[PDB]
Design a protein around this ligand. Structure first.
Ligand SMILES: CC(=O)N[C@@H]1[C@@H](O)[C@H](O[C@@H]2O[C@H](CO)[C@@H](O)[C@H](O)[C@H]2NC(C)=O)[C@@H](CO)O[C@@H]1O
Ligand SMILES: CC(=O)N[C@@H]1[C@@H](O)[C@H](O[C@@H]2O[C@H](CO)[C@@H](O)[C@H](O)[C@H]2NC(C)=O)[C@@H](CO)O[C@H]1O
Ligand SMILES: [Mg+2]
Ligand SMILES: [Mg+2]
Length: 369
């Protein structure tokens, strides 16, 4: 199995003990580390942070302590939008400018592949033709990587993609049978399945549907999404399950109404380290739980939730990671990917569960070490 771990180049700016850089990564935990994110300028891949080149060196130097580790560079992400991707795939010339820039960039800085994180072809303003042009891009990138390995006499650079977990976005965005022929791995973002945007409580990454859910609400679970990809053309061995090391937060309209689906208001509280409404890192979650929150196991969906006063949290813990790891193994998937290792309790001093408690759980369950 593969354990693919995302690292984010803005974690360095979090205050105090939240600050995280590549030297804080245990090189033995994952099989692949993915660097989020590169950007794009004039259809060429670029850095985005002033010290990316330094962090790239520190990131790929982790391979000096694990000969099997591979690293990839992710381009895009949610906040990158779609317009630069649309423009880049719109002509063969723009695509070749991009592919050429990617090859030089990955080889120069020491990466083993590219993770495409366009969120998403055919949605969020991307026009309908981008569904097919994404296939064209991935095929041309795969073929260019094949030819560069021949011409450079080095192992082929990998091409992977992080892909939608929402069915509407999947249907608008991906030619799954053809895409799956050229991608090395498909990183399915089976999280953010519920959150404050809905106006009621729900789990970030439930394994199964809640018993009353029907119709399109019944799409919002890991089991359905992964089987959607599998049964629409993707080989299971290429499919990687997404595991969040964070949770979503909500404000309950009434503290007495605190189950799944309870009405909520606003964007949800922010944490002192991640400082973003609606979102807590696992180490921020531990601070909340320790202060007297009520903990509930959502038995039907195999995930925990917690609440205190009018604050409600849908999240993952060791138990839920363990259940979903055994589920992905029993369904023959290629492994797991984590968003993101800088959100684990990497110091071990927030959760009293040891260093990297969530990532270590998957390392053990997937037989990584
Ligand atoms: C693959 C992907 O799109 N992941 C998302 C993250 O990028 C989001 O994090 C937010 O990312 C922006 C881009 O640099 C940061 O400026 C912002 O501070 C960051 N927020 C946090 C809490 O790290 C993430 C949360 O929005 O959602 C996806 O994971
Ligand atoms: C299944 C599905 O499509 N869920 C959507 C959520 O993904 C989405 O939330 C946003 O997701 C991004 C990555 O998927 C995150 O970067 C972003 O922070 C998050 N927005 C939040 C937490 O407020 C919402 C859009 O808000 O819609 C769902 O449909
Ligand atoms: Mg600082
Ligand atoms: Mg009432």
């Amino acid at each position: 199995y593969n354990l693919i771990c995302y690292f984010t180049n803005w974690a360095q700016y979090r205050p105090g003990l939240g600050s995280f850089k590549p030297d804080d990564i245990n090189p033995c935990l994952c099989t692949h580390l993915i660097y989020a994110f590169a950007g794009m300028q004039n259809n060429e891949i670029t850095t985005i942070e002033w010290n990316d080149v330094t962090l790239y060196k520190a990131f790929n130097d982790l391979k000096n302590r694990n000969s099997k580790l591979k690293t990839l560079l992710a381009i895009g992400g949610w906040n990158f939008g779609t317009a630069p991707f649309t423009t880049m795939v719109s002509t063969s010339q723009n695509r070749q400018t991009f592919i050429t820039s990617v090859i030089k960039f990955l080889r120069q800085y020491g990466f083993d592949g590219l993770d495409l994180d366009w969120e998403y072809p055919g949605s969020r303003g991307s026009p309908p033709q981008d569904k097919h042009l994404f296939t064209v891009l991935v095929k041309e990138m795969r073929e260019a990587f094949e030819q560069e390995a021949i011409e450079s006499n080095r192992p082929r650079l990998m091409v992977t993609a992080a892909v939608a977990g929402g069915i509407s976005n999947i249907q608008a965005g991906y030619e799954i049978p053809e895409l799956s022929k050229y991608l090395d791995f498909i990183h399915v973002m089976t999280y953010d399945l519920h959150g404050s945007w809905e106006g009621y409580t729900g789990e970030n990454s439930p394994l199964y549907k809640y018993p009353t859910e029907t119709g399109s609400n019944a799409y919002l679970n890991v089991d359905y999404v992964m089987n959607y990809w599998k049964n629409n053309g993707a080989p299971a061995e290429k499919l990687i399950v997404g595991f969040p090391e964070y949770g979503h937060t909500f404000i309950l309209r009434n503290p007495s109404d605190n189950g799944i689906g309870a009405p909520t208001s606003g964007d949800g509280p922010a944490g002192p380290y991640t400082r973003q409404a609606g979102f807590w890192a696992y180490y921020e979650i531990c601070t909340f739980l320790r202060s007297g929150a009520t903990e509930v196991w959502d038995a039907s969906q195999e995930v925990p939730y917690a609440y205190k006063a009018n604050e409600w949290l849908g999240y993952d813990n060791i138990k839920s990671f363990s259940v979903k790891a055994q589920w992905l193994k029993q369904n023959n998937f290629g492994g797991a990917m984590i968003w993101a290792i800088d959100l684990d309790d990497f110091t071990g001093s927030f959760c009293d569960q040891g260093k990297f408690p969530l990532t270590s759980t998957l390392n053990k369950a997937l037989g990584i070490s």
